[PDB]
């Protein structure tokens, strides 16, 4: 990952939730994240490295309990990796710039669009409003 | 449970984490809770109903990532229920007065005491200092 890892800096700058989610692949509980129901126009950036990851225009109502997007801003900003943790097989999504754990992607997204549900922890993101 | 249920009031008074943990059996991520490492003398109360649940004297450093106690204040204050969720069989611990989800109890606690680890979400509790 291009963005250099500096653990000391992250621990100083990130909240415990942000750090655990992004660095230890923790999962914020459903219906507790800041951006779960956000509908404002803008861009969701990696909380770690600031790379733009998701646009408000791709955010949709999934009812799953986390921010949910049907596509990232482009095919380059996300890295996918199989995840066999927690007695499940899933596809983890990471920031391709810095490697931050973001969430998971599922094949139960909008059938009228991409069919994909990018299920992202709020604590992995920071929102830049664009009114 | 005797303590009368008002979801609307809870939604207003509790933070989303406290609400989802106690009412929907969410689990705070490990290493994110406020009280995980707390050593101060005092009493941990149910965040929902205020019942005294655990004493600082029964709190110990388990290293598991959540507040851990080897016994509650007395046996009467906790209800236990088998929990078959999340692909595991565990013993849920609830507040006996209001039914709040608190956490789980495991049999890997200090053998020089109860041998039990009551593993409790910080977000289910509110600490009262008795210094
Ligand atoms: Zn990043
Ligand atoms: Zn209670």
Author numbering:
A (entry chain A), B (entry chain B): 10 to 140
Article, verbatim:
The Microcapillary Protein Crystallization System (MPCS) embodies a new semi-automated plug-based crystallization technology which enables nanolitre-volume screening of crystallization conditions in a plasticware format that allows crystals to be easily removed for traditional cryoprotection and X-ray diffraction data collection. Within microfluidic Teflon tubing or the microfluidic circuitry of a plastic CrystalCard, ∼10–20 nl volume droplets are generated, each representing a microbatch-style crystallization experiment with a different chemical composition. The CrystalCards are manufactured with materials that enable a balance between X-ray transmission, optical clarity, moldability, chemical resistance and surface energy. This system produces diffraction-ready crystals by allowing crystal extraction from the CrystalCard or in situ X-ray diffraction and structure solution using diffraction data obtained from samples within the CrystalCard.
Using a fine gradient, the crystallization phase space of a particular protein–precipitant combination can be carefully interrogated for crystal optimization or mapped out to show the transition from precipitation to microcrystals to single crystals. Crystals formed in a concentration optimization gradient screen of 30%(v/v) MPD, 25%(w/v) PEG 1500, 0.1 M acetate pH 4.5. The protein concentration was 22 mg ml−1 in 20 mM HEPES pH 7.0, 500 mM NaCl, 5% glycerol, 2 mM DTT. However, 10–20 nl plugs contain enough protein to generate crystals that are large enough to obtain useful X-ray diffraction data. Crystals grown in plugs are typically 40–200 µm along their longest axis (the channel dimensions are 200 × 200 µm). Protein crystals can be extracted directly from individual plugs in the MPCS CrystalCards. Crystals were removed from the CrystalCard using a 0.1–0.2 mm cryoloop, cryocooled (using the crystallant as the cryoprotectant) and subjected to X-ray diffraction experiments.
